[model samples]
Target chain A: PQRRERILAATLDLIAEEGIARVSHRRIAQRAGVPLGSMTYHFTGIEQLLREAFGRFTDHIVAVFDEHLGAAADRDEAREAVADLVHELSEDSQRDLVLTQELYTLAARQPAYRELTHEWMRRSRVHLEKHFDPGTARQLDALIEGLTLHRALAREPHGRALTLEAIARITTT
Target chain B: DPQRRERILAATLDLIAEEGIARVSHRRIAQRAGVPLGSMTYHFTGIEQLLREAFGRFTDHIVAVFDEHLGAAADRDEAREAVADLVHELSEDSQRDLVLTQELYTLAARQPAYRELTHEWMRRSRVHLEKHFDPGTARQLDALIEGLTLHRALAREPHGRALTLEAIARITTTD
Candidate 1:
């Protein structure tokens, strides 16, 4: 019970720190303080472990999106909510950024991971659609992901004004 | 002298495209490049050095493409079309480009050294975009290019040229 939770948590941590390449039974087991056999016994294999780890990651991010967008009562509020979301994520920890890029890399490489990303994007749009139309919701969703990445990766700080402007431009029409 | 070094870099990019960055090692790279194992260290200090050169060359290659289109655009409208064209060109079933970019991002995500390379690449793109639009809109347009390209890569839906043009139009459109 708790041991499995530890294993998954360790798996996510490894991915966050070192990318998926670093994950292995021995590595994760050592990091999780579990024995080698426990890895196979708890999960079917490395693939299963990866699925569970990334699943938890997806849920965690989607919850954050839901929290902000779900609280908006009107279009203006929704726009502001989205702006705040971008601004916050732009400043998220490096660990968060690393984990996200790791997820994207996996999605680009394989079908199984792409399914998770597709579902993640779909859920994000569903939340955005609460205040905006479907087309705007989808565009705004992409904008959020893109701006967050660029701002996070950019050498200079992408000030909050530019963020608000990007949100405004996409959500306006 | 330069031929072997160039071969190693080309082979490194090829390996990254075929396999992921995870598979890159001196031994693997030497075998792929048809160079001796000792040549890896002789040419470059280590794996990090090799990756930096390979990715730097990659960044330059993509930026050169950006310059070709954005460099030639006469006005905002032309720039808008050019941006769309660039996106379309990039999205062409070039799996190698997609894999290499993703691999670079993965590398940058973990380390600051690689992040500088990413930042420089983004800056280069923005500079090109700035020739057509104001700085704020240019940055936003740059971000949109990145986002749309990525979604197009991963999504099952066909990210047709129509949608690509529409996104460029929206971001570069003045309110």
Candidate 2:
């Protein structure tokens, strides 16, 4: 309903549908159905708007971590929870993977966006630390990334047992 | 000289690096490479082939790095060190490499053929690892190297080497 919200929604939509390179203010405004002038009215420029849009994207992903990892009663549950996330995340939609990798690409190039991902990593690690040490948390975090990449890139996705094994292996420290 | 095709792909990578791939065009790439516009058609069948091969060659460059690091390790002990060396070496360099890898990844996510390129890339990377580690450890370690390299790049501090060893040890513990 709000212009800023509409614009943010439209920006990610444009990215997910086409690619980040295809996203632009003129394209965003048309997709948002807002006045072209509203682009600057709501946000100073494209980068500002994109920062918020992608920042929100990271927030949404962290929430997924929170929801999945929050319900864990102990380390075992957390372990299962982490494995579940890898499958659900990879299987439910490729959209999440696309958004994250897109952020990573941007993050690699620019510092501001890089800070956005660092914080995203920090917050995701916070949830992870609830059940595991920071070392284990960070290691598990990377495992999730690579395994999910495995599911997406490989012709056959590995099973939960394999996911749990990697988690178990990494957490063995 | 006779390296027109190589120059064209090099220019394509530069254009994608400076300008995102979404806006890259045959005319732009040709002009950047200083080749005739018609020559692009002669080099590659179409823009897709050009983009695919450019990214494909980029993967070749990366696997060669994998070879240089992992191939020299005399034993599993040194192999683990090689893995850490590879992560640190890669994580520190190549903001352009990071961008290009992600571009190819995003490219593969949307397009099907690019998928084959990455699968081969992953397979080749593991072949280097499998020389020292078991099949399973090599596969999982491949993923760990990827994860560590990405995080270390964004983390931007060398707090990575210790963590690099830790992650590698955990995955390779069984072997």
Candidate 3:
């Protein structure tokens, strides 16, 4: 159990720090002190390890969604909280952002990873839908995606007021 | 050296688009590009240099793509239509392209060099949108395209044009 936890944790750490191309099962085993040459002994295949690692990442992101989206009281507060959520997402550790892109990159290339990607999106959208209607939730999900990514990657990264304004536009139902 | 340098940069994108950015090495890229391994350094400074140079070219290629879609717009409303069309075509262009964008984002996610690459990419992408809308709306529109392009790419059936149409409409409404 401890080995399993370490294996998952290390898989993400290595992918975040080094990127997925540099990740290897043997190295993951070594990183975890599991003392095995082949991670297949622990996981039937490498995808299992990767899937479980990213699977854990899914829960972590969902918790972020719940922590922010669930805490909102109403329309006025929800808009502000949504802006705050975008800011919160942007300031998260570099690993979370990198891990997110890594997971997404893998999902696009590898079919097995799609479920997690879709599930992560669906869960976050569900969180939004609880406060907003389905259509607003759907597009707003994309808005958050765009807003946060631009914040992280943009040279001048827009501020909270702009984020609030964008949220206001989409939630105008 | 000029032609060979271009080949190497193109190969860098080929390798990343196929495998990913992190999987690429100078020696490996040289093999993919069909050049002497030493050319990786001779034509460029290092892996870091080759990466930015290669990805910078890729960034330009996407900006050219933005022009193709947005340049033809006649008015503000037409610009919205053009953006929806761009979102569809962007995801529709090829799955290879989807992977390429994600590769660049992942690169930007980790390193400052790559982050600056994305900054310019985002800035240039907005130039066309800003032509039709205010700076703020252009920015938000750009991000929506990002989110929609990606979400659509990963969709089981992918989204119909309706979603892109409406999402763009909402962001660009300017009310």
Candidate 4:
């Protein structure tokens, strides 16, 4: 279990560092200081490792939503919170943001990989629903996805800031 | 007139629009375009120039399409209507909106040369936005366009018509 966790974590790190295209069971083992035998032992194939890595990322985003939503009171405030959350998320230096965008690209081509993304959308929408009606909640969910999509695409200069302002507007109104 | 040049450009966009931006290399483009390998270098200075021309043409086409839809509106209300049209244009498909932009993004990440292409597109977008709103509002409008497009492109859930129109109205309608 210990080796598997380390290997999976390292695989995620490799994905964050070198693009997902380069990540593999062997490379993850190399990064995690484990042997090839252990990689195959834990994950029958690379996709299993990929699935775990996605799980880690999904957990992280949902946790962030929890924290963002927890800090606010009432629907109106929560709306502002959602918008600001995105802008603030822009400020987050975690490599997860980059990985998140990359995963979206991969998911586009593969149907199986999309399951996590759809789940991510559902979890993301739950947080939005707390602050607004279904219509507004869904719109905010889309806004968060759209805005973060821009942010994840790696904008320079005021990309983060501009998106933040838009999020703020969307959240507040 | 210039078959090789035209083919090179077409190949790049075809690759970008179809499979995503990562596949557009000189060799790959040539292979796909059915042109000679050296022919790529013959028409263009290098890969950067090739990409610039390709992206430039891509932006031109999008702007041209917007122009056709946009010309119908002559006033504030018309601009709002035009903004709605822009949203509809983007929401058509996730593959084109989300994938193409991501492809350009992947290119921008590795290539410093492409940033100017991005900057130019942004600059042009801001200019067009300035037609309806003041400088401040235009900037916000630009941000919305970037944020909204990127979001819908990647996420499964569509931003949809009502929200799209509401967002357009919210930002543009404000003082």
Identify the leading candidate in terms of TM-score.
2
> What lDDT tens digits, residue by residue, belong to model 2 across residues A1-173?
58889899999988888888787889999999999999989898988988899989988989999989999998888899999998988878778878887887787778667777788878888999999998889988888888888778765666787778888899885
lDDT of 2 by residue, B62-127 (tens): 999999998899998899989999998887778788888888888777776778888889999999
At residue A19, give the lDDT of candidate 1. Answer: 67
DockQ result, candidate 4: 0.33
Tell me which residue pairs clash in candidate 2: none
True contacts kept of 4: 0.23
By lDDT, the better pick of 2 and 3 is: 2
Q: Rank the candidates by lDDT, best first.
A: 2, 3, 1, 4
lDDT per residue as tens, model 1, B63-167: 998999999999988898898888867755576787788889878776767888999999898898898899889989888888877876777663677767777
For model 4 chain B, the run of ten residues with the poorest summed lDDT: B91-100
Ranking by TM-score: 2, 3, 1, 4
Which residue pairs show backbone clashes in model 1? none
Give the CAPRI class of candidate 3. Answer: medium
Could you give the DockQ of candidate 3?
0.74
TM-score of candidate 2's A chain against the true A chain: 0.95
Please, what are the lDDT tens digits per residue for candidate 4 over residues B28-68?
Answer: 89998898899988898987788789888777766665566
| Model 2 TM-score on a 0 to 1 scale | 0.96
